[PDB]
Amino acid sequence: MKTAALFVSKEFEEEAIALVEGANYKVTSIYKLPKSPNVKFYIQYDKLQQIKNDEEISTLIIFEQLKPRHFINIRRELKGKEVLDKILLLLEIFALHAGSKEAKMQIELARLKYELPIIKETSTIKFYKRRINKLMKELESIKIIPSIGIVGYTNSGKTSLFNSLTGLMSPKRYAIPINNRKIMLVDTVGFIRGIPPQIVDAFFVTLSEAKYSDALILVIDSTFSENLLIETLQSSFEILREIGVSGKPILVTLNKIDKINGDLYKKLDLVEKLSKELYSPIFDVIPISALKRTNLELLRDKIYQLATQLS
Numbered sequence: 001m002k003t004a005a006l007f008v009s010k011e012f013e014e015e016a017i018a019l020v021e022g023a024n025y026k027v028t029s030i031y032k033l034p035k036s037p038n039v040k041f042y043i044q045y046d047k048l049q050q051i052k053n054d055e056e057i058s059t060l061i062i063f064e065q066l067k068p069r070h071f072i073n074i075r076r077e078l079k080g081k082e083v084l085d086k087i088l089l090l091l092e093i094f095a096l097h098a099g100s101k102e103a104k105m106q107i108e109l110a111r112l113k114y115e116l117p118i119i120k121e122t123s124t125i126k127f128y129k130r131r132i133n134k135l136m137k138e139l140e141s142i143k144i145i146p147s148i149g150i151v152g153y154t155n156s157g158k159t160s161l162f163n164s165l166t167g168l169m170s171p172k173r174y175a176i177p178i179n180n181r182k183i184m185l186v187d188t189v190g191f192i193r194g195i196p197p198q199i200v201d202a203f204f205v206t207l208s209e210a211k212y213s214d215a216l217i218l219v220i221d222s223t224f225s226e227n228l229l230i231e232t233l234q235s236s237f238e239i240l241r242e243i244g245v246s247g248k249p250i251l252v253t254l255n256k257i258d259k260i261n262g263d264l265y266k267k268l269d270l271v272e273k274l275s276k277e278l279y280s281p282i283f284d285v286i287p288i289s290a291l292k293r294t295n296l297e298l299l300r301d302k303i304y305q306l307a308t309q310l311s
């Protein structure tokens with residue numbers, strides 16, 4: 001596929017894996033961040049030589065923000081093999097999920113702005129600012145069958161749910177038949193934790209495409225403690241309100257129920273009471289396991305009923 005070597009702290013590893021896969025990479029190797037980073041190469045020189053020459057690794061991904069000197073030196077070595085740091089990784093995730101011209105322009109504006117300090121540390125500078133100025137110009141100027149979008153935080157199992165329904169391009173829109181009805185399933189970008197300031201506008205503009213969909217499926221990790229559940233739901237419904245989602249039916253799926261080892265009904269009833277406190281209209285709240293294929297027919301049937309309600 002696209003294979004990545006990923007450098008990440010233990011604290012972020014789980015999260016960064018799910019991010020790398022949202023950027024359509026397979027993680028084929030994982031290393032901690034270097035204790036004592038290399039002034040030139042950030043990662044160790046011998047490691048960089050191995051990755052340089054390993055035709056099974058297409059891309060180096062470092063879950064941190066790299067200095068311009070690191071980019072210059074890494075890109076030199078890799079010789080056409082790609083390096084993403086954390087900002088460029090998330091811009092890649094956005095680029096793969098964005099279908100609108102406005103989002104595409106914000107992503108490109110961010111990527112241009114991020115290259116500037118790299119070029120400055122290396123006329124080209126002038127070429128880049130003219131494009132940056134043009135896009136900013138055009139952005140300030142633009143400012144003046146049923147579709148169900150899948151939303152939720154990273155690692156909640158949005159891709160697992162989509163794959164499971166589809167039986168599986170960018171952006172990912174995939175029509176499926178349920179009974180006698182055709183339904184368009186839309187992979188929206190996730191809610192993302194810890195978004196670097198530089199890319200917040202590209203993030204929100206990409207996410208705000210969720211308002212194109214007739215209805216939404218909101219995916220929530222059931223393994224979360226009760227107070228983490230409350231917070232996740234408060235923040236999901238916070239964000240949806242602020243991007244201008246209003247009156248769209250929302251089907252909430254409490255996922256990963258297989259991994260709960262614990263009280264599913266109390267979790268379910270908490271999620272249901274709270275989601276209905278925070279938002280209207282809630283279509284329904286159901287428990288599933290997208291991995292273990294638990295309650296998939298329930299999910300199926302509820303997507304069909306919701307599609308019947310929309311039509």
Ligand SMILES: Nc1nc2c(ncn2[C@@H]2O[C@H](COP(=O)(O)OP(=O)(O)O)[C@@H](O)[C@H]2O)c(=O)[nH]1
Pocket residue numbers: 018019021022152153154155156157158159160161190255256257258259288289290291292
């Ligand atoms: N145990 C369990 N794991 C799941 C389930 N759904 C997804 N996952 C896993 O959790 C991680 C996040 O899943 P993914 O579908 O990519 O989440 P996303 O970042 O929101 O798209 C992946 O390792 C999935 O295999 C589930 O129902 N149960």
Ligand SMILES: [Mg+2]
Pocket residue numbers: 018021022158159160
């Ligand atoms: Mg995913």
